[PDB]
Amino acid sequence: SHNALKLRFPAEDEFPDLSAHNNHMAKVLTPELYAELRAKSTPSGFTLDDVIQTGVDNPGHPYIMTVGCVAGDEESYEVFKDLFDPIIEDRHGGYKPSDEHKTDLNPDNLQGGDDLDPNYVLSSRVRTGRSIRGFCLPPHCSRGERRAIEKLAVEALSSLDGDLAGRYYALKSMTEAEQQQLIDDHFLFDKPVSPLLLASGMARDWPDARGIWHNDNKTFLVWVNEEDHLRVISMQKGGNMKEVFTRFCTGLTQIETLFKSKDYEFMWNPHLGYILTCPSNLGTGLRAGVHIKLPNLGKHEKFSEVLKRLRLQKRGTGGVDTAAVGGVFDVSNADRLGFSEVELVQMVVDGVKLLIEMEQRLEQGQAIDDLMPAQK
């Protein structure tokens, strides 16, 4: 046993140096908490050192605040709750250990959002992730488990029909140009270059058992075995978020149904909602957003604050690990736990509209300056 060897050393000699680190894990992990949890392990053998490695290796990130830790299996969140609970509370605006997560996958509860200004919104996307109970998560899953997961996913998705009928495209089976085309077109996950993906062990055996399934129009897609067992995605050009979300809920429900038929269930509990690798993706694990052109807003003052006020996050055109190019920003809901899928999409819709108005505060004749403070 390796952990057994490490346990021969006093806890202080193994405690990581997080002095110049800026991630959620670093903000919570103390010498005391490390000494208390370093001897524990989940049934699959995942340990605290495994949980925090990415956060030790990556002091920060150039575009967003990172969590700095991952779960290796469903039991990770329980065995190491004294580490995860505070992180979750911080990352998800005060979500406490005693709080409950609520789901709402009914499109009808989303007001408007069916016509975000086309001149500003180039495309709308809604995604989430799901883990199959009984298997270890990507940071820890063996080649055998990953292949088993791929087998089940492929089997299940082959049942989707109608507008959701599609095909599975194994990473290994596509040419270099085919892969890059899908990536650049915003459909497929990038090559394993993410500092998180690398340091957490999620890039092992790449591209074995990884792939993408999608319908003919590429408006509904499922990533298999990338950062999570499954990443369910609904997307299309334009700003009809309502339509995107409706298709999302429909396909997501049909997928769970298919899995249940085979007696498989997604990792889920009343407190954390759906369980995923990264604590930031718990609850709904939902990220709804748009590629929005705001060449001046992205430059304007306190833009970072307007997004913070609306619980929104910004990413590059190529995603979280990229910068915005041509003034096109990736704007989506920053929160995922403590709000329902419907409430989340509603925040993006309402937030975008504002961003647009704030976007039109110069080309015509206006600008924030008068009615602003007076916080109430």
Task: State the DSSP code for 171.
Answer: G
Between CA 246 and CA 109 the distance in angstroms is 10
Q: Taking contact as CB under 8 A, which single stretch among the options 99-107, 225-233, 257-265, 334-342 is the one that binds a copy of itself?
A: 257-265
Q: Taking contact as CB under 6 A, which single stretch among the options 96-104, 157-165, 313-321, 357-365 is the one that binds ligand ADP?
A: 313-321
DSSP 81-130: HHHHHHHHHHHTTT--TT--------GGGS-S-S---TTTEEEEEEEEEE
Q: Taking contact as CB under 8 A, which single stretch among the options 259-267, 271-279, 356-364, 368-376 is the one that binds a copy of itself?
A: 259-267
Among 122, 148, 183, 306, binds a copy of itself (CB under 8 A): 148
* CB-based contact 214:187 (threshold 8 Å): yes
Kindly state whether residue 195 participates in binding ligand ADP, applying the rule CB under 6 A.
no
Nearer to a copy of itself, 119 or 304 (CB): 304
Would strands 328-333 and 312-315 be described as parallel, antiparallel, or unpaired?
antiparallel
Given the structure tokens 């498989």, which residue do they identify?
Answer: 264
Nearer to a copy of itself, 100 or 178 (CB): 178
Kindly state whether residue 122 participates in binding a copy of itself, applying the rule CB under 8 A.
no
Residues 228-267 that bind ligand ADP (CB under 6 A): 235
Among 106, 119, 304, 366, binds a copy of itself (CB under 8 A): 304
> CB-based contacts of 361: which residues, under 8 Å, 6+ apart?
367, 368
Kindly state whether residue 158 participates in binding a copy of itself, applying the rule CB under 8 A.
yes
Query: Is 341 marked as a binding-site residue?
Result: no
Q: What is the CA 352 to chain-centroid distance, rounded?
A: 20
**Shortest spacing between CB 239 and ligand ADP, in angstroms:** 10
Query: Which strands form 328-333's sheet, in the order they lie side by side?
Result: 166-170, 211-215, 220-224, 230-237, 121-130, 287-293, 328-333, 312-315
Between CA 310 and CA 348 the distance in angstroms is 8
**Shortest spacing between CB 94 and a copy of itself, in angstroms:** 24
Between CA 175 and CA 35 the distance in angstroms is 48
Among 318, 327, 343, 353, binds ligand ADP (CB under 6 A): 318
Q: Taking contact as CB under 6 A, which single stretch among the options 5-13, 130-138, 283-291, 303-311 is the one that binds ligand ADP?
A: 283-291
DSSP 152-164: HHHHHHTT--GGG
Among 38, 315, 341, 351, binds ligand ADP (CB under 6 A): 315
| Residue 269 parent element (H or E) | strand 268-269
Between CA 178 and CA 192 the distance in angstroms is 16
* CB-based contact 266:274 (threshold 8 Å): yes
Selection from a copy of itself, ligand ADP, none that 173 binds (CB < 5 to 8 A by kind) is a copy of itself
Residues in contact with a copy of itself by CB under 8 A are: 61, 63-64, 144, 147-148, 150-151, 154-155, 158, 165, 167-168, 170, 172-173, 194, 208-209, 257-258, 260-263, 295, 299, 301, 304, 316-319, 322-323, 326
Annotated binding site for ATP: 123-127, 186, 231, 287, 315-320, 330
Annotated binding site for creatine: 67, 227, 280
Residues in contact with ligand ADP by CB under 6 A are: 123, 125, 127, 186, 235, 287, 289-291, 315, 318-320, 330
